[PDB]
Design a binder for these strands. Structure first.
Ligand SMILES: [Zn+2]
Lengths: 138, 94, 124, 208, 83, 100
RNA sequence: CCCCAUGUGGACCCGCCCCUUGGGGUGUGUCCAAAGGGCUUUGCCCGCUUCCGGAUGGGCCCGCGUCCCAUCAGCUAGUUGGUGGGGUAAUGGCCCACCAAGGCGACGACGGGUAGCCGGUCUGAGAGGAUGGCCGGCCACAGGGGCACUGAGACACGGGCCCCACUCCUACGGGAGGCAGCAGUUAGGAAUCUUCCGCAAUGGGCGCAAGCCUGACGGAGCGACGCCGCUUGGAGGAAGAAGCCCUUCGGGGUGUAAACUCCUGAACCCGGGACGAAACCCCCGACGAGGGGACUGACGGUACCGGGGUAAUAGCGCCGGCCAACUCCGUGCCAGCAGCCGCGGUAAUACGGAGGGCGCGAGCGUUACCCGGAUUCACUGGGCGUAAAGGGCGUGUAGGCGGCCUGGGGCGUCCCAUG
RNA sequence: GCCUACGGGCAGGCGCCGAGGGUAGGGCCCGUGACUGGGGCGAAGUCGUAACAAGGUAGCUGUACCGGAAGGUGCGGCUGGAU
């Protein structure tokens, strides 16, 4: 069974970039939408539009890559090198505001879900809250 | 092999006998007043309950009756009496 | 293992077995020598090593090594033990503290005197 | 046993000039002049490439031996220096240069570091007014490290100051030769130090 | 009967006290109730004795016989000066 | 603040007493995930009102019997065997897994 | 000690009003008080009685936390609950009687093993692991087991009663003992101190006070057992003594090291000499505030200041790799070394001595034990095709885990304040 | 019996509980031990050659019986079998 949504998502994303696709589909859902909402505004991706595949609702997340390298294997640096769920189901991990992590000397980002909504470590702290720390991405 | 802080034991005995005679005294009186109410001696029963209540409160004055101790005895006595005086009402004295 | 596993079950912490039954965690322990042999070495090296069977205060009657170019350990002599296995001499997990008790310090030692329990020789 | 044995031999062990005797380690002879090889029967022999450890080591010592201070204090200092907010290295030299015995030396009230000690243990040193015999003492900024009235007319000290009219004092220090006084201005900066050492190696060494 | 006393805190030859309030029955250097000042026998610092009369007054009020020596320090602090 | 627990009557064989199943939740002291644990309290019903399968609020009371220092507060949600059933099947299972 | 009276008040029964598990107000009935002593003796001090409150101290209770073994899986009969009664300061199976048939257990009952618990401490980047003596807080015993008395409080280490083991007196009937207090004795052991000084200070008890007691304590002493400071000297001094070591015999080295020159001056000597101590007391003032007077140190003639003053202990480990430090000789799989890999059978940087060298210094080694390295029990942070690891397969119980939209609740979860 | 203001108190007596003991039976843990299995070590003798190359009858294996020995054989399974 599909045991963790977000998780799948992240993996479709992760799994797509690696092969270098332009965009990748993925089951829609307000929440998942708010995460993609972040990515693009954070710049890890171009953007995403709502869609219907044979009648079902899907989110087209549009991939973003780096320039063509020189020399051998000109496989472009990927905008999203790292991306993993931190709090998994059956080992959920909530953090306190003090405890919010700094990612990659603050190069990456972290996304939680606070009672004031789904956020970025930076935003959270600016916001004075903490919550389910969904994922690392850099 | 001596120590004068033993005089205390020499004393405790004195109080053992002291307390003893008082405590038992009460028991007897209570146990006396009791069987009266069984028979319905409304007059005398109390005549005794009264001698009881006093004795109790008297020990309470000293180190013989813990304090509230007197109290319990005062409750467990009177109550055990009133009730019995239902088998034949009308308290004579009061 | 699934986190649940780690939950229901938990990690087994590694128990430690002591390489030395000097009963108490004592550093040494005196004992009376029983037999004084000369066990032969192990596989590669061969020679003739002086050894001693010792009855301790803890109860066990063990085998200890006697370092030094030569000792002076008799039958019912009292001795002392420090503990220190010997590779080419199996079953010999202990040692005899030289210079303490009825065991002498090696005579004619001018080097690692700290051990062997000799004393500062003269010249000034 | 706070060392005290053959000296301008260490000038030799390190291969860098160790100003351990003062006058003389200026005459053709801190030995490094004309006998740079290290001591021992094998001094003149070709030396193999020194393990990372070796350099980290030899360099600790170079520091240490200069100040001539029992590892135990030296390491203690370095520990105390790790606990202070700062560049773990510069601060080290900080206290290192703040020891009464050193100060005296820099103040010029002595031919050498060693000499300075005695000067202290024998008590020829005033400190903000009172005498002091504990060298290891830490001279706070703004202290009048001086000479005891009693000691002023000394064949040694005298002949020393006589020399001072002719040498600038460390930038973090002042002194009025005329009155044989001197003040400790402020903790000296790494940029101010001359030392032929590389703290980094020293630090790197204490993490093994 | 809660008293008001001193507490050894210095060391071998370096006595440094501690004015406090605690139940008679406790140890010298044992769990006190409300620390209200310290006094330095040898007087090395210009500040060899403090008090906070405000709290001192509380105690006495509620009933807290102070030690002979103890009191003396409270008097110096002006614990009881009624002018 | 005298403690208050919410749980369920599972036992009703006793006199004026009821066994209440009280579930608690919390992150594992080291592994982090939410562990769900529980305990049974012997509540106290004077007028024998509370019945099996009822959810109730427990409150710390004056000691009563050996191991019966709680009175029941108010009935929360009545009729819900669902939970009992579980407790029961678990108990029954106990009969298995042995050396008889 | 007892009795009798007074009763501010307080107790108990009953009734009502308020509260709300035995909280508070109230009415009648009944029951309950008590000691005197001292002076500066017509008043002040100490003490006394009943009651409300305070403060401090504590009993009982509950939630969460709290080691290993499942080669311990079922435990329980006062046992789980109820009524009544006893008992207590008090709730309670705590105890008794009767009644009911329960209570607990894989969210590990019961059995076994081990261990006083914590603040903290050790290590660790941390998470964690280890510990829990000195100091402080709490518990537990005071030869073994039982029990109660007296008391605000004990089931009472230097109080009591009994039995038991042990030691000693004994006219053999019967007794006397308990250092896990300080010091010490002996035993056991690798190993752990002086039958010291003082009651000056701090604290405690009793006292109106002077004051008494205080092996609590404050000191000294013994142990490099730890840590920290300190010394054995400083400067000058040869293209370089001697001896010892090495050599390609020319020389290298030990080495500015020494000698010797000058200078300083630990030890040691003489003198001075301490804070810690200012109270209670006494006096004046109202025994208040405030002010004045007196006594009183174990440490100790010690610290410390002044003067004078001798150049005046160095040792242990290591030098094949890890790992800083190399030559010669003796030796010859011997003697021996060794943490691990190993070294030694005539050329040993690995044995034994020596010269030399490195390391550390009143210390250095060794053994033992903790954490560490070890992400080698893996939460951080592991694995399972052949390296050790998928259950021979299925079935499904407990349990874990779970799809999209909207709303309520908000337990988890996050934020604020506060204790 | 002792005391008394005769209300009542002490002495004593009996009783329950009860530390501990006796008798019977059971369980469980420590010491010593005759008799006894195998084990691991180590240089190395003895008889044979099983395995490692198709090791010279491919090997390995559950089982079963047999045998100085290693092992042989049956039956089934496997390749982790050379050509
Ligand atoms: Zn020099």
């Amino acid at each position: 069974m599909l045991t963790d949504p977000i998780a799948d998502m992240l993996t479709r994303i992760r799994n797509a970039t690696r092969v270098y696709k332009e965009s990748t589909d993925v089951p829609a859902s307000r929440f998942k939408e708010e995460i993609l909402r972040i990515l693009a505004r954070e710049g890890f991706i171009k953007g995403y539009e709502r869609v219907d595949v044979d009648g079902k609702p899907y989110l087209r997340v549009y991939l973003k890559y780096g320039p063509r390298r020189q020399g051998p294997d000109p496989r472009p640096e990927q905008v999203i090198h790292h991306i993993r769920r931190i709090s998994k189901p059956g080992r959920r991990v909530y953090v306190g505001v003090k405890e919010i992590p700094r990612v990659r000397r603050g190069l990456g980002i972290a996304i939680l879900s606070t009672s004031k909504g789904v956020l970025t470590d930076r935003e959270a702290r600016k916001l004075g809250v903490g919550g389910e720390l969904i994922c690392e991405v850099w | 092999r001596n120590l004068s802080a033993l005089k205390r034991h020499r004393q405790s005995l004195k109080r053992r006998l002291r307390n003893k005679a008082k405590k038992s005294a009460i028991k007897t009186l209570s146990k006396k007043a009791v069987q009266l109410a069984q028979e319905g001696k409304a007059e005398e029963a109390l005549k005794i309950m009264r001698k009881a209540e006093s004795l109790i409160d008297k020990a309470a004055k000293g180190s013989t009756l813990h304090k509230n101790a007197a109290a319990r005895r005062k409750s467990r006595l009177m109550r055990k009496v009133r009730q019995l005086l239902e088998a034949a009402g009308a308290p004579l004295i009061g | 293992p699934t986190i649940n596993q780690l939950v229901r079950k938990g990690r087994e912490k590694v128990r430690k077995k002591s390489k030395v039954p000097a009963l108490k965690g004592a550093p040494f322990r005196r004992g009376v020598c029983t037999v004084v042999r000369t066990v032969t070495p192990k596989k590669p090296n061969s020679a003739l090593r002086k050894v001693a069977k010792v009855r301790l205060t803890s109860g066990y009657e063990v085998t200890a090594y006697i370092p030094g170019e030569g000792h002076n350990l008799q039958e019912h002599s009292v001795v002392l033990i420090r503990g220190g296995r010997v590779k080419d001499l199996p079953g010999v997990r202990y040692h005899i503290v030289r210079g303490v008790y009825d065991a002498a310090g090696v005579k004619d030692r001018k080097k690692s005197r700290s051990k062997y329990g000799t004393k500062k020789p003269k010249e000034a | 046993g706070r060392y005290i044995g053959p000296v301008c031999r260490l000038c030799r062990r390190e291969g860098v000039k160790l100003y351990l005797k003062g006058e003389r380690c200026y005459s053709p002879k801190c030995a490094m002049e004309r006998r740079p090889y290290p001591p021992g029967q094998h001094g003149q022999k070709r030396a193999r490439r020194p393990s990372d450890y070796a350099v980290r080591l030899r360099e600790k010592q170079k520091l240490r031996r200069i100040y001539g201070i029992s590892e135990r204090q030296f390491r203690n200092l370095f520990e105390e220096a790790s606990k202070k907010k700062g560049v773990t290295g510069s601060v080290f030299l900080g206290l290192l240069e703040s020891r009464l015995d050193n100060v005296v030396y820099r103040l010029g009230f002595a031919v050498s570091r060693r000499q300075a000690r005695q000067l202290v243990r024998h008590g020829h040193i005033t400190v903000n007014g009172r005498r002091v015999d504990l060298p290891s003492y830490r001279v706070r900024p703004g202290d009048e490290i001086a000479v005891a009235e009693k000691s002023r007319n000394l064949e040694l000290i005298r002949q020393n100051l006589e020399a001072m009219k002719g040498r600038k004092v460390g930038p973090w220090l002042s002194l009025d030769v005329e009155g044989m006084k001197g003040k400790f201005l402020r903790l000296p900066d790494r940029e101010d130090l001359a030392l032929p050492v590389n703290e980094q190696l020293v630090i790197e060494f204490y993490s093994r | 009967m809660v008293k008001i006393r001193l507490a050894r805190f210095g060391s071998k030859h370096n006595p440094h006290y501690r004015i406090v309030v605690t139940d008679a029955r406790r140890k010298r250097d044992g769990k006190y109730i409300e620390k209200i000042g310290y006094y330095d026998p040898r007087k090395t610092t210009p500040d060899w004795l403090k008090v906070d009369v405000e709290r001192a007054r509380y105690w006495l009020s509620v009933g807290a016989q102070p030690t002979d020596t103890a009191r003396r320090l409270l008097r110096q602090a002006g614990v009881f000066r009624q002018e | 603040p005298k403690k208050v627990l919410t749980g369920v009557v599972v036992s009703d064989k006793m006199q004026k007493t009821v066994t209440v199943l009280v579930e608690r939740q919390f992150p594992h002291p080291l592994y982090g995930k939410v562990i769900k644990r529980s305990k049974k309290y012997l509540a106290h019903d004077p007028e024998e009102k509370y019945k099996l399968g009822d959810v109730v609020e427990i409150i710390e009371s004056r000691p009563i019997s050996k191991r019966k220092r709680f009175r029941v507060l108010r009935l929360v949600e009545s009729g819900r065997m669902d939970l009992v059933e579980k407790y029961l099947i678990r108990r029954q299972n106990y009969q298995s897994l042995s050396k008889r």
